[PDB]
Amino acid sequence: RKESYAIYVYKVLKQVHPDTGISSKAMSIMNSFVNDVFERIAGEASRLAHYNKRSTITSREIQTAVRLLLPGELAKHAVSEGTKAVTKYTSA
Amino acid sequence: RKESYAIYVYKVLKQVHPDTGISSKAMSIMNSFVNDVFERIAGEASRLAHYNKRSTITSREIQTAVRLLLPGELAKHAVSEGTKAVTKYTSA
Amino acid sequence: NQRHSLQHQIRVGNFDVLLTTYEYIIKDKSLLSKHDWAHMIIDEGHRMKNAQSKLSFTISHYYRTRNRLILTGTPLQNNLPELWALLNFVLPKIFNSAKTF
Amino acid sequence: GHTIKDQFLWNYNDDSISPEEFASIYCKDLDMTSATLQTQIANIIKEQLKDLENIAATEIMSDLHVIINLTCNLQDRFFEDNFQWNLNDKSLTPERFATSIVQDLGLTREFIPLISQSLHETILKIKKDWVDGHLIQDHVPNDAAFGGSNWCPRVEILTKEEIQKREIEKERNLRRLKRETDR
Amino acid sequence: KTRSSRAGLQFPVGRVHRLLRKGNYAERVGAGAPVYLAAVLEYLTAEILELAGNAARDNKKTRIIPRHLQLAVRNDEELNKLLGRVTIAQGGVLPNIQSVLL
Amino acid sequence: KTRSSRAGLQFPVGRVHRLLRKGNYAERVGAGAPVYLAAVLEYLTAEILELAGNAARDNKKTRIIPRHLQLAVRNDEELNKLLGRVTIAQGGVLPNIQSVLL
Amino acid sequence: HRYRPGTVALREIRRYQKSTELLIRKLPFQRLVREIAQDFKTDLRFQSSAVMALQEASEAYLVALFEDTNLCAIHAKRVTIMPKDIQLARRIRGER
Amino acid sequence: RYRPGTVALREIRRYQKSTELLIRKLPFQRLVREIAQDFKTDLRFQSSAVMALQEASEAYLVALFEDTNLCAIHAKRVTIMPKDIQLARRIRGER
Amino acid sequence: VLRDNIQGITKPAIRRLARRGGVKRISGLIYEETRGVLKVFLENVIRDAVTYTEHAKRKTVTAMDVVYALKRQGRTLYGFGG
Amino acid sequence: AKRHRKVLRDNIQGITKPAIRRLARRGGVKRISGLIYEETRGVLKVFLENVIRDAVTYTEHAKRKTVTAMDVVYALKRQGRTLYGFG
DNA sequence: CGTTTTAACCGCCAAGGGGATTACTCCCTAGTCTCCAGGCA
DNA sequence: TGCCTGGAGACTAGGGAGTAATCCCCTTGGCGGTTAAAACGC
């Protein structure tokens, strides 16, 4: 097997645009972008938890990470959505 | 207790010129430089061992990190010193 | 330009035999594939060897004939790695059974 | 060499002037009369109509409440404001609400045909998603128990310093907001 | 019962949590960090995909190509600031001729 | 008995080993890698202090000040290329006259 | 029928900025990559994806540097890039 | 009055020889506090933090002045203009 | 309450900075541009430092957080920590 | 010459003048001087030298002899320039 | 812009060499406990 | 100079790393043919 973010990006695209498709090259580019953002946020949260002498990566660490990396509006909406997701995860 | 490379930098300085002194500001500068270089080399070696799916940081990883980070002659001198050091550590 | 002029002059098929090369079979497939063929003869059959080659694939996709003649001065390579390819090119006998031989 | 920018409401339900006579007088007034300009005007205000003729405030018959957050700009002292507006109400027309706003504040007369029009456009947007998933959740800005430290959300101030970035910001917000409905 | 459905997302919460665990970023990982990270990732992906779809529809194309991704990331100033140091293969450069050269 | 004495270096290999362990850089760490890294750091600090002492002796000073360290870093092209992005307190880089702006 | 200089240049600029085709041939760039890698280690193999990524990165860096030197030349009230323009661009970028 | 250009050279030599601070403490501290009031109110600052901010500001401004000086030299100009700084920040990739 | 303190940075300060940088002649319009770029740089650095402090549950900005912010934007500052 | 063609064209000359011309046209340059070619060739040579050295070090650390695409991706990512569409 | 040249691109032929695999071994480092002297106040 | 905790030594083991066995696919080197691209000149 070989794991990838292809089907998830495809589902998001079909949920935002039901007509327009996506090619293999664009899918690989999107997967690389997702991996880059993931590793950026992970390293940010890791060094943030290290600066506070902590050892548990929690929602606050990822929130600070996205507030530091994503500039301006891209931050705000994101964290809002994030909070929303968190709240929904507390619902079930 | 707090840790610092002050005494070690002082000893290294005394092993080059015993008459030349050093100020507290320069000592803190050297300590911060040591910390920054150590963090750089450690992160480089960690990501190198991760690229090879390894879980053990060995002398080869640090050697590759030094050859990637230090430019030219510095890198050569560093790797030579490291080899001599590990040889002297394995001899005893 | 001379090839295009010749193709234009004979675009209606006012010819008896068309003699071309594999390079012209491939490059000019956009014009020659429109005509149907009944019998084809290919010389230097040793280059046709690969069944998945661009030459054989182009021959298959461009047109379909009933009689196929292969001429060559020496049999397939000693190790006969693509003998089944020549067999399928010649007759539909080993096409569906070559994998077990 | 000069560009023209303006807004106006048509009310196409009557027929006393055509999109050609309006341009015939709008360019004669500006004294930039040109056949290409009159045709350019009749080539833009007709598509707006045909695109918006399908949406009318009739047969709504639904007590709907929405937090209208609009922003106006007249290339000097632009402003933004958000309040509670109840659909399915015919007593208060946006023109009267605009006259009230221009009367209470120290605003020139030219702001009356600016806040009303931009408000109608919002109404059309509120009616656009009404043709589909437009369920009205209890969206409140403030209360006391059922359905106030300060009125920081409820602001009608005017600002000279341009925050000329809302166009992308609103589109950024709107695109995510639309996907929020589906879940 | 997958946690993505509980949280209401389309991204794999379990895969993100596993990548956070085996990535040696820390010794422990909470339960809200994976869902939060997946939310940020899916928001960014949805924004980029929406912009790419709009760009493709403007170019009357129904299949997104790297050119559309480049146009969408360079038109929006926010993503341009975010991915300014990142080059995209087969994306080219946006057409921009100087006034002194026209 | 300290392992640094066996290796022959003055830097504490035990401290570097502990930092690499509790630094969450990997799941396991070797035994020769801390000694190697300590030797690299010792050589780097030796070069820096040697150049700083040379600069101080050139300026007729009996102590090392941040100005001497800055001069030693900016003079050597190798360290300049290595330390190009880092800024150091007590700045100023190189006294130089431009031949075109006399 | 001849055109005055400058118009065909603008047409080519528009054509190249519109398209995304590669402006460097595959085999010469691959041979140059192999020659440059011979100096670091001999008898080294190369995947097609590796040389393709190298070509893409090189073209991206080159077009970025060309945009920068064009801006630098326009700052000098000129329409001709010069070696000193590229040198100034590389010195300001810090990758000298 | 000397010929314009010699006091400039003397100041160049003096400031490149010295290693002192060029920005006063209190104005920079007030500016930092004013800028920090926007992101969060009722904050406090340490002297070391303000000193580090001042050192970083001085280093960045000296680097930018070197870059704009080179840019002005390229345009056959001994004087610097705002367009030079704008070009420097555009080439650096931050404008 | 502090507001409109950018005037604290005065023309002699910018002149001294330019002399340190090697500038021989400075136009009168340079000061505004230097003040603006200084304001935006301080805005970015102080925003990052305030985020660091808020994450650290502290009420006092420290030099360590300033060093971390400079590393985030990308630069290392010796002599103050980190 | 009938004896031999005597062709010794260097490998660095593979990137020819029209290639650099197309690159400059894509970059937005109207008129190009005649000395730009050698300068950009040297710049490209230095950049390729750096990237190839980094990729060779990366692939040698893993004891492999084939320079893969991921090695070049990591080499580019190290220098602060991430490339997409290859891994 | 023209005219002359020629090397790049698609197509074929052959081979062998690392990059993949899986299976077995093995010893290095992660602990855990017990001293202790180099490092800190 | 005095004090102590991080560092060091001895014992245990298991899992990651080293080494052998296996094989095919990607690569390398070369040639044919065509022609759009590269070179030289005014």
From Swiss-Prot, chains A, B:
Glycans are attached at residue 80. One of its GO terms (molecular function) is DNA binding. There is a cross-link at residue 88 (Glycyl lysine isopeptide (Lys-Gly) (interchain with G-Cter in ubiquitin)). Keywords: Acetylation, Chromosome, DNA-binding, Glycoprotein, Isopeptide bond, Nucleosome core, Nucleus, Phosphoprotein, Ubl conjugation. The keyword NADP does not apply. GO terms for cellular component: nucleosome; nucleus. Monoubiquitination of Lys-88 by BRE1 gives a specific tag for epigenetic transcriptional activation and is also prerequisite for histone H3 'Lys-4' and 'Lys-79' methylation. GlcNAcylation at Ser-80 promotes monoubiquitination of Lys-88. It fluctuates in response to extracellular glucose, and associates with transcribed genes. The nucleosome is a histone octamer containing two molecules each of H2A, H2B, H3 and H4 assembled in one H3-H4 heterotetramer and two H2A-H2B heterodimers. The octamer wraps approximately 147 bp of DNA. Core component of nucleosome. Nucleosomes wrap and compact DNA into chromatin, limiting DNA accessibility to the cellular machineries which require DNA as a template. Histones thereby play a central role in transcription regulation, DNA repair, DNA replication and chromosomal stability. DNA accessibility is regulated via a complex set of post-translational modifications of histones, also called histone code, and nucleosome remodeling. Belongs to the histone H2B family. This is Histone H2B 1.1. It comes from Xenopus laevis. The lineage of its organism: Eukaryota, Metazoa, Chordata, Craniata, Vertebrata.
Swiss-Prot record, chain D:
It is found in: Nucleus. Phosphorylated in the G1 phase. Disulfide bonds: none annotated. Residues 1-29 are annotated as: Interaction with STH1. Present with 3940 molecules/cell in log phase SD medium. Interacts directly with STH1. Component of the two forms of the RSC complex composed of at least either RSC1 or RSC2, and ARP7, ARP9, LDB7, NPL6, RSC3, RSC30, RSC4, RSC58, RSC6, RSC8, RSC9, SFH1, STH1, HTL1 and probably RTT102. The complexes interact with histone and histone variant components of centromeric chromatin. Component of the chromatin structure-remodeling complex (RSC), which is involved in transcription regulation and nucleosome positioning. RSC is responsible for the transfer of a histone octamer from a nucleosome core particle to naked DNA. The reaction requires ATP and involves an activated RSC-nucleosome intermediate. Remodeling reaction also involves DNA translocation, DNA twist and conformational change. Belongs to the SNF5 family. This is Chromatin structure-remodeling complex subunit SFH1. It comes from Saccharomyces cerevisiae (strain ATCC 204508 / S288c) (Baker's yeast). The gene is SFH1. The chain holds residues 214 to 408 of 426 of the full protein.
Swiss-Prot record, chain H:
The modification N6-lactoyllysine is found at residues 17, 40. The modification N6-succinyllysine is found at residues 17, 40, 83. One of its GO terms (molecular function) is protein heterodimerization activity. Keywords: Acetylation, ADP-ribosylation, Chromosome, Citrullination, DNA-binding, Hydroxylation, Lipoprotein, Methylation, Nucleosome core, Nucleus, Palmitate, Phosphoprotein, Ubl conjugation. The modification N6-(2-hydroxyisobutyryl)lysine is found at residues 17, 25, 40, 83. The modification N6-methyllysine is found at residues 17, 25, 40, 83. One of its GO terms (cellular component) is nucleosome. A lipid is attached at residue 71 (S-palmitoyl cysteine). The modification N6,N6-dimethyllysine is found at residue 40. The modification Phosphoserine is found at residues 18, 47. Its main location: nucleus. The modification N6,N6,N6-trimethyllysine is found at residues 17, 40. The modification Phosphothreonine is found at residues 41, 68. The modification N6-crotonyllysine is found at residue 17. It is found in: Nucleus; Chromosome. Belongs to the histone H3 family. Core component of nucleosome. Nucleosomes wrap and compact DNA into chromatin, limiting DNA accessibility to the cellular machineries which require DNA as a template. Histones thereby play a central role in transcription regulation, DNA repair, DNA replication and chromosomal stability. DNA accessibility is regulated via a complex set of post-translational modifications of histones, also called histone code, and nucleosome remodeling. This is Histone H3.2. The chain holds residues 41 to 135 of 136 of the full protein.
UniProtKB/Swiss-Prot annotation, chain I:
Its main location: nucleus. The modification Phosphotyrosine is found at residues 31, 68. The modification N6-(2-hydroxyisobutyryl)lysine is found at residues 11, 24, 39, 57, 59, 71. GO terms for molecular function: DNA binding; protein heterodimerization activity; structural constituent of chromatin. The modification N6-acetyllysine is found at residues 11, 39, 59, 71. Keywords: Acetylation, Chromosome, Citrullination, DNA-binding, Hydroxylation, Isopeptide bond, Methylation, Nucleosome core, Nucleus, Phosphoprotein, Ubl conjugation. The modification N6-propionyllysine is found at residues 11, 24, 57, 59, 71. It is found in: Nucleus; Chromosome. The keyword Ubl conjugation applies. The modification N6-lactoyllysine is found at residues 11, 57, 71. There is a cross-link at residue 71 (Glycyl lysine isopeptide (Lys-Gly) (interchain with G-Cter in ubiquitin)). There is a cross-link at residue 11 (Glycyl lysine isopeptide (Lys-Gly) (interchain with G-Cter in UFM1)). Core component of nucleosome. Nucleosomes wrap and compact DNA into chromatin, limiting DNA accessibility to the cellular machineries which require DNA as a template. Histones thereby play a central role in transcription regulation, DNA repair, DNA replication and chromosomal stability. DNA accessibility is regulated via a complex set of post-translational modifications of histones, also called histone code, and nucleosome remodeling. The nucleosome is a histone octamer containing two molecules each of H2A, H2B, H3 and H4 assembled in one H3-H4 heterotetramer and two H2A-H2B heterodimers. The octamer wraps approximately 147 bp of DNA. This is Histone H4.
